[PDB]
Amino acid sequence: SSNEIHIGSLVIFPDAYVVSKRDETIELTHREFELLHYLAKHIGQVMTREHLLQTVWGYDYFGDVRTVDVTVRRLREKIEDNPSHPNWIVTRRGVGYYLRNPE
């Protein structure tokens, strides 16, 4: 099942392919949603760009790993109040990324 995930005031509706923060809907690209949605399925788990790449982009996709960085930047600009210190999408320096479990 997959009706909707809540993370703080951030809501994910996998079925409708929709996201809202504080109730405001946020327009995301297909890719952006895919990534955010995947991190929301594994809340609080750190994952490498290498892993996220094949997982969200596909095992057949061998483009550069910075695409995950580019996509995480865009999600931050679109979702974070202040991207300088993300509240949801966090960087585990030298390892990868993860969606933060609000305590």
Per-domain boundaries in the chain: 1-103
Angstrom CA distances, 99 to 8, 62, 64, 75, 87, stand at 11, 24, 22, 11, 9
Strands (E), 28-94: 89-92
DSSP 22: T
Are 19 and 26 in contact, with CB atoms under 8 Å apart?
yes
| Cross-strand partners of 12 | 5, 19
> Hey, what CATH topology would domain 1-103 get?
Arc Repressor Mutant, subunit A (1.10.10)
Are 63 and 74 in contact, with CB atoms under 8 Å apart?
no
CA–CA distance, 84 with 6 (Å, rounded to integer)? 23
Nominal resolution in Å?
A: 2.4
Q: Which residue has the tokens 């504080």?
A: 22
SS3 98: strand
Helices (H), the chain: 30-41, 49-52, 66-79
SS3 92: strand
Axis crossing angle, helix 66-79 with helix 30-41, rounded to the nearest 10: 90
